[PDB]
């Protein structure tokens, strides 16, 4: 017989390699006797990155008895409200893409994340920049949920690490405004810029505008830049190191290269680990009643995954060493 886990993701509209990590993992689990003798099967639901469809899917998984746990969703604006539904149903929701601090700030007991939050990434960036001797910086943020969340965290940890935020701003109307801003920043003694704007939503246009004006200081960004050559030197805080020395990572990278003909993405890796994580917790619990699964996950760790060690706190955040800092160099990522 079978055990099912649901996956909620914008499958059709995305080519992120996430489904390929999933497929690879399921395969590996089944070809070793599966889980408790049972074969593992995914029930895929496409949320189209739309809140209405996201919520309907969450609902549908909640009142389907065969579902042990759900993996998803990709977007924080869907995951936060969807978590409400899984938590009320006693169903474990394990998210591999949603970085918002707010996801684990509501006392939900069955809600999990297998990647570092925007907050943990921001903290590691602050530590790194300060260790490099960065003293005075400027933040470029967007006034929305992601922008504010990431900017806020970085401001905090930056002060905690000795860095002065000399300026923050969320708008410039044209290149001469950016020229005026930069004159001001030079007077402040700015030595770096943190971009808390998504890459597709204003981040990259700013990269271009900033080169064009003559800005020389290092540039730093968050997760949404893991997904042209003027980004040289851009430091990105993300996760998954495909050059991590351990045999667990190299086996995965090799197996993936073989089957798919390209290196894995961090979403593919997050996908892979989520399935293995859930299967491994599942091999140890009572499938009779899937709300023992949550406590299962908090005693599972540490669990060696393709991304590094996984360990959950009581809020459900992943708090193992998983943040990977990446610098752009000649088109590809270097790892520090
Ligand atoms: Ca200082």
Q: Give 274 Cα–ligand 1 centroid separation in angstroms.
A: 39
SS3 50: coil
Instruction: Enumerate the known binding-site residues for Ca(2+).
Output: 89, 135, 162, 167-168
Q: Give 136 Cα–ligand 1 centroid separation in angstroms.
A: 8
CB atoms closer than 10 angstroms to residue 38: 15
SS3 6: strand
Q: Give 133 Cα–ligand 1 centroid separation in angstroms.
A: 9
Q: With beta carbons less than 8 A apart as the criterion, state whether 270 and 306 touch.
A: no
Q: Minimal CA–CA distance to 29: which of 3, 65, 6?
A: 3
Q: What is the phi/psi pair of residue 97, to 5°? A: -130, -15
Q: Give 188 Cα–ligand 1 centroid separation in angstroms.
A: 14
Helix (H) or strand (E) holding 130: helix 118-131
What is the full DSSP assignment across 248-295?
HHHHHHHHHHHHHSSPPPHHHHHHHHHHHHHHHHHTTS-TTSTTHHHH
Q: Give 231 Cα–ligand 1 centroid separation in angstroms.
A: 28
Which residue is listed with tokens 């699964």? 293
Q: Give 158 Cα–ligand 1 centroid separation in angstroms.
A: 9
Q: How far apart are CA 309 and CA 46, in angstroms?
A: 30
Q: How far apart are CA 147 and CA 263, in angstroms?
A: 30
Instruction: Enumerate the known binding-site residues.
Output: 89, 135, 162, 167-168
Q: Give 213 Cα–ligand 1 centroid separation in angstroms.
A: 28
SS3 208: helix
Enter the DSSP assignment of 85. Answer: H
Q: Minimal CA–CA distance to 300: which of 321, 322, 323, 276?
A: 276
Q: How far is CA 77 from CA 99, 100, 146, 291, in A?
A: 10, 9, 9, 25
Enter the DSSP assignment of 223. Answer: G
Q: Give 183 Cα–ligand 1 centroid separation in angstroms.
A: 22
Q: Give 116 Cα–ligand 1 centroid separation in angstroms.
A: 26
Q: How far apart are CA 246 and CA 96, in angstroms?
A: 21
Strands (E), 50-131: 67-71, 92-95, 111-113
Q: Give 144 Cα–ligand 1 centroid separation in angstroms.
A: 29
Q: How far is CA 158 from CA 80, 165, 184, 205, in A?
A: 26, 8, 21, 25
Q: With beta carbons less than 8 A apart as the criterion, state whether 85 and 58 touch.
A: yes
Q: Give 117 Cα–ligand 1 centroid separation in angstroms.
A: 25
Q: Minimal CA–CA distance to 185: which of 166, 171, 203?
A: 166
SS3 113: strand
Domains and CATH numbers, the chain: 1-117+239-322 (3.40.50.2300), 118-238+323-336 (3.40.50.2300)
Q: Give 164 Cα–ligand 1 centroid separation in angstroms.
A: 7
């Amino acid at each position: 017989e079978e055990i099912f886990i649901g996956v909620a993701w914008p499958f059709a509209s995305l080519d992120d390699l996430f489904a390929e990590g999933l497929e690879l993992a399921v395969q590996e689990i089944n070809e070793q006797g599966g889980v408790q003798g049972r074969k593992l099967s995914l029930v895929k639901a496409d949320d189209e990155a739309e809140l209405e469809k996201g919520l309907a899917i969450a609902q549908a998984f909640a009142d389907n008895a065969g579902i042990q746990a759900v993996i998803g969703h990709r977007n924080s604006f869907i995951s936060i409200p969807a978590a409400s539904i899984y938590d009320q149903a006693g169903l474990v929701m394990l998210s591999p893409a949603s970085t918002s601090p707010d996801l684990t700030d509501h006392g939900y007991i069955h809600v999990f994340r297998n990647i570092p939050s925007d907050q943990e990434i921001a903290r590691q960036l602050a530590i790194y920049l300060a260790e490099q001797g960065h003293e005075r910086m400027v933040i470029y943020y967007t006034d929305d949920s992601y922008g504010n969340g990431l900017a806020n965290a970085f401001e905090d940890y930056a002060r905690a690490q000795g860095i002065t935020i000399v300026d923050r701003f969320n708008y410039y109307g044209n290149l001469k405004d950016l020229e005026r801003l930069y004159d001001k920043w030079q007077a402040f003694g700015m030595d770096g810029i943190f971009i808390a704007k998504t890459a597709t939503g204003g981040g990259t246009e700013f990269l271009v505008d900033a080169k064009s004006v003559g800005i020389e200081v290092p540039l730093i960004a968050g997760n949404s830049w893991d997904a042209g050559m003027t980004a040289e030197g851009l430091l990105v805080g993300s996760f998954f190191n495909p050059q991590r020395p351990d045999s667990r990572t190299q086996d995965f990278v090799e197996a993936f290269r073989r089957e798919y003909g390209q290196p894995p993405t961090s979403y593919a890796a997050a996908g892979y680990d989520a399935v293995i994580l859930l299967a491994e917790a599942l091999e140890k619990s009572d499938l009779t009643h899937p709300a023992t699964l949550a406590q299962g996950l908090r005693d599972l760790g540490p669990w060696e995954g393709v991304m590094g060690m996984h360990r959950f706190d009581g809020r459900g955040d992943d708090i193992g060493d998983l943040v990977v800092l990446k610098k752009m160099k000649d088109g590809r990522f270097e790892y520090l």
